Paper text:
To further probe the shape of the ribosomal exit tunnel, single (23+L, 24+L) and double (23+L24+L) insertion mutants of uL23 and uL24 with loop extensions were also designed, with eight and nine residues inserted into the uL23 (23+L) and uL24 (24+L), respectively. These designs were drawn from two representative sequences of bacteria with exceptionally long loops (Candidatus marinimicrobia bacterium for uL23 and Actinobacteria bacterium for uL24). In particular, the inserted loop sequence of 23+L, which comprises of positively charged residues, enabled us to explore the role of the electrostatic interactions formed between the uL23 loop and nearby rRNA segments by cryo-EM. Unlike the uL23 loop in the WT ribosome that primarily interacts with 23S rRNA H6, the extended uL23 loop interacts also with neighbouring H7 helix: the guanidino groups of R73 and R77 in the extended uL23 loop form contacts with the phosphate group of A90 (H7) and the ribose of C455, respectively, while both uL23’s T81 side chain and the G83 backbone are in close proximity to A64 of H6. The extended loop structure and its interactions with H6/H7 were identical in the empty 23+L ribosome. On the 23+L ribosome, however, this interaction face is occluded by the extended uL23 loop, which is highly positively charged and interacts with both H6/H7 rRNA helices, thereby reducing NC-rRNA interactions and eliciting early folding.
Residue numbers in the entry:
A (entry chain c): 2 to 272
B (entry chain t): 1 to 101
C (entry chain 6): 1 to 46
Write the structure that this text describes.
Amino acid sequence: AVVKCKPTSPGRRHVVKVVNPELHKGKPFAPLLEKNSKSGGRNNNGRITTRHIGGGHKQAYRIVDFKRNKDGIPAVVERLEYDPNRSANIALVLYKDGERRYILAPKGLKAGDQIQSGVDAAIKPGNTLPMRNIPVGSTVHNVEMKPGKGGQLARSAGTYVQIVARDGAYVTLRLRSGEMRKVEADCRATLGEVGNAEHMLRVLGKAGAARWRGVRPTVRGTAMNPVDHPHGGGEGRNFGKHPVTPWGVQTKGKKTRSNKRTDKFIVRRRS
Amino acid sequence: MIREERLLKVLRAPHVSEKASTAMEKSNTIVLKVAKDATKAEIKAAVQKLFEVEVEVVNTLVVKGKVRQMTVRSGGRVIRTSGRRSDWKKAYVTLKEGQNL
Amino acid sequence: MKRTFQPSVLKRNRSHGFRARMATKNGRQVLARRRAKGRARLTVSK
RNA sequence: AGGACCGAACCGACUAAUGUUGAAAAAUUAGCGGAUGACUUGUGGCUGGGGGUGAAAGGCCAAUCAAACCGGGAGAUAGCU
RNA sequence: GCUCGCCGGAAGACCAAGGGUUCCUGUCCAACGUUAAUCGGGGCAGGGUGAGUCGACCCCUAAGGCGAGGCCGAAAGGCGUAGUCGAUGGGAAACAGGUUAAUAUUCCUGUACUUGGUGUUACUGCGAAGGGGGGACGGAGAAGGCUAUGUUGGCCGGGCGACGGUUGUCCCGGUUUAAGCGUGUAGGCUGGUUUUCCAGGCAAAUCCGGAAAAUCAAGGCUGAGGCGUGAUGACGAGGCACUACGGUGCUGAAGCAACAAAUGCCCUGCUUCCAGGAAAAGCCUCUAAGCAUCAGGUAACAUCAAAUCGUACCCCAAACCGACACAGGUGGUCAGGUAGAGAAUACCAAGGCGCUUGAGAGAACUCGGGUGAAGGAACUAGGCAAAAUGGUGCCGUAACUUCGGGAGAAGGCACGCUGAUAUGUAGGUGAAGCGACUUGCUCGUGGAGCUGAAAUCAGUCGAAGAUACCAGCUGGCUGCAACUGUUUAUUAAAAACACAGCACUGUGCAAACACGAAAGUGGACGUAUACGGUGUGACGCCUGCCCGGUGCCGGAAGGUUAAUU
């Protein structure tokens, strides 16, 4: 649940933790780990391409089965556990031919639950089916956009999409942003919403809590010099200009999507 | 089977230097200068065949050459020149019970 | 206090050595210029 | 337990005096701040000049920075001295 | 040489980096050395660095680099796959004594250990660029068991005091001993052993994973320390032939126990937390192709090989970085005594130094200090500077508050030494003895011996008992910024920047956006509870009206309007 820390010092006064007592406290399952070295926001040219990234705690990448292609094999949830790479929790499951895998943990899942993939699977959370086999109106997560590619929508902590209509070879989903998307019905989705829904409620409390998540400080543009950012100088606090990015593009309203290749699939833009 | 010519090239000179005389008279080891590219097996074989002694073990070190400087009267002027002595290799050869020189 | 030259042989060779010069055409041009001048020590590789 | 407390190593640099052809091209002495952390440090590595990096000061990029250094255009031009 | 002084968590010792002979010896004093110089890190000559086990090389990989083909790009070239390099990390084994003027885990003495080759014998299923184990990993905290180490006693050797006393519960010194081999205990982890089966480990496995059944949990891994051996050896205070008395040389006693102990080891443990904590090889194991009374594997024994390069010296400094023999800078290791909480501080040990111009004098003035009558901020821009406070225990402590704070609030009192309680107490440790046992690295009991606070009563000295060093000034009202943090290396540390929080806005994933004439990369092996930009800046109560202007968003009937024809 969410717990408020007692104010025994500033920096503890405002921190709200979300503690999950059923998360497995122990080492992760080794055969599905690999190193995941940090980047600092730098690309192969060595330049900062994304600002405000660096430092943080060392973390290993857990190979999560986003495809769910083991069809007709029942699996039992061995244990839930923490993943540093995701806002959601993962579940280590045991396909009873003897193979372990990591899946995203839906809301109600717990150790001992049975999950299954395929077209003949039952309609209960954790089961993965093609979207043509899933009743219209149901909430799903970890949705494929291209058949056989793996889930890409609704993978965050408490997200899900709604199947609002089925039009022949395509389904219409209400994405979490409020956007109506059209996706072919042969893609797969997992029933239920993602688990760690109390994720938003955490309050970091102090600057260091963000620093050890890998986030470097953000200098306001208006605090810079005119050579550094279009929000230039002026003695005192002077703005007198339309807010823009560090590279001059007007922020605070201007649209930036430009993709004619895929915009035939967007039956409605988000609100 | 190191060939004869190799052996005839490796042993350059006996090194007389007090520490060498004491080594000879105390530990029964002779001290001698060897080709800088000589290996312990080469020195062993060369000493055994060319001095007709039986050797136990060889220790080797490389002496780095000092810098000496002096003058040269080339061109009538005595120009002060400096240069490095040549590095050489020193071998401590432990004979078993024989004696050669 | 602390000064700008903090020696290290490995970094010296990796930054200005012979093979570092020969790696790119620009370093090879440096070497050609130094040969043309008649430099006794071509690189830091001493 | 803690970007908790007092306080050495360690990391800083608030005040004063000295020094100012210095012991030193930024230090010394007496005090001063942090000292389990957004800490500090060793060895490697990466980012290159209208570029980098910047908890932002036009700061730092080899005692050099509102555009480094070296060579070249080059004997730039100088109604000025 | 004898005194004196200074350091002593260093100004001692050993290294890495860096330097490159500065190391040792003999000579010389021009120049160098801030003076003289017989001296020197100076000149000149000679000598000095010894490894199967230390390090490099080497096997393996991180960040990253290069990169066959490849994909891009006027050219140069960019990126990158297979691969190949790249330690600051992982892979194998030596200890103690002695010795040189200068080297030592390298030489010598004694005792070891590791890996590989080749043979002989015996018994045998062997075989991978493939599979699985393992290597293999965070922060903090808390014990407990130990050891390094120290103190005291015992023992051994020496002593009997330049001045009162000193044959005693007197004085000085020493009481050291390793790797290896054997044993396997304080602790830690884990149920084990068979049989059958299989949609997993790209194939296949007799290995790993999974499912059943039976039967015993009584097994196994790991593991400091102790003990034994190593060792009738070595070392050993000190004596004695010898002797340039430098010093060589020969003998050589005791060589035990208790107690207190680490920040070191058990411990890569255990508990706990969230921020969720390298890789690959060596190593163990399973088989595929393949081989077939071969080859290979395991064991014992024998034999051989372990190359090459470094090794001197300085290394918080006069050898490195600062033009200097420069008051600066420089990572790791070691960590003795008495007080002390302590690696602070004071005095010392081991060890090392007195800082390469000195000799007088005892003016002003300057620098660094000490003390001052009476006053006590009158000084000054300003209590700047100085003075002052300063410890432990107990008592006591306000407004305000986000209930944590404020708070060491403020303010008090008791501190030395001696004796009793108690010839040393509570506590800690714990021998002998007797008992057990699943029988010694055993348990229970027992209390010798050792160590040992704190308190109370009584007395006692001084002006003063946290006596030195060390070591908070305190309170009241306000501006600003919530706070810890960051910044103008070298005149600005702030109210500036950041910040957690808040809002707006973009972004549906080949995401927006950024670096790139491109390929590509970052964002992210993330996917709207996510990511980017912008403003504001904990928290509390709140955030009113204006869309005319400028931007942005949406719309398209009409006016105007490019190339083109």
